[PDB]
Design a binder for these strands. Structure first.
Ligand SMILES: [Zn+2]
Ligand SMILES: [Zn+2]
Ligand SMILES: [Zn+2]
Ligand SMILES: [Zn+2]
Length: 119
DNA sequence: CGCGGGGGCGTCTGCGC
DNA sequence: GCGCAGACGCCCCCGCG
């Protein structure tokens, strides 16, 4: 509390005080995904928790699909969609079922969740 | 039924304050 | 030195031919 002082944070609803440099550094990373933003479009008022979410959201208004498939030339707006679509050519289906009479595999976690819902 | 496409979220890395 | 942002990865949910 004098010369020697603890670490602090500035984000809402946090403790705003930490005791370990790296523990606080890691803590700071947590809030980078919680920083409040709003849509920057001409006719929107939605909110986001990060620049990346807001930037992604802008793609829905702007039609910006820069992630073009090297094979299909199909333009996507997200890397996770492109990498997911990529597995279509890569035969990469790691999400195998665990039912007592199945071993069918999917390339998406939610596709496996869906499979189980139809099992 | 396989896959497109948007939401929210954690996170390493890099940059800027 | 820390904080924020930019960018990568996934889960989750919905809709379509
Ligand atoms: Zn904090
Ligand atoms: Zn918007
Ligand atoms: Zn393709
Ligand atoms: Zn199964």
């Amino acid at each position: 509390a004098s010369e020697k002082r603890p670490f602090m944070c500035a984000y809402p609803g946090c403790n705003k005080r930490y005791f370990k440099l790296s523990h606080l550094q890691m803590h700071s990373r947590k809030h980078t995904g919680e920083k409040p933003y709003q849509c920057d479009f001409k006719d929107c008022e939605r909110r986001f928790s990060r620049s990346d979410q807001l930037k992604r959201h802008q793609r829905r208004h702007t039609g910006v699909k820069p992630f073009q498939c090297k094979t299909c030339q199909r333009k996507f707006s997200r890397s996770d969609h492109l990498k997911t679509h990529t597995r279509t050519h890569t035969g990469e289906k790691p999400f195998s079922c665990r039912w007592p009479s199945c071993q069918k595999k999917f390339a998406r976690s939610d596709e496996l969740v869906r499979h189980h819902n139809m099992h």
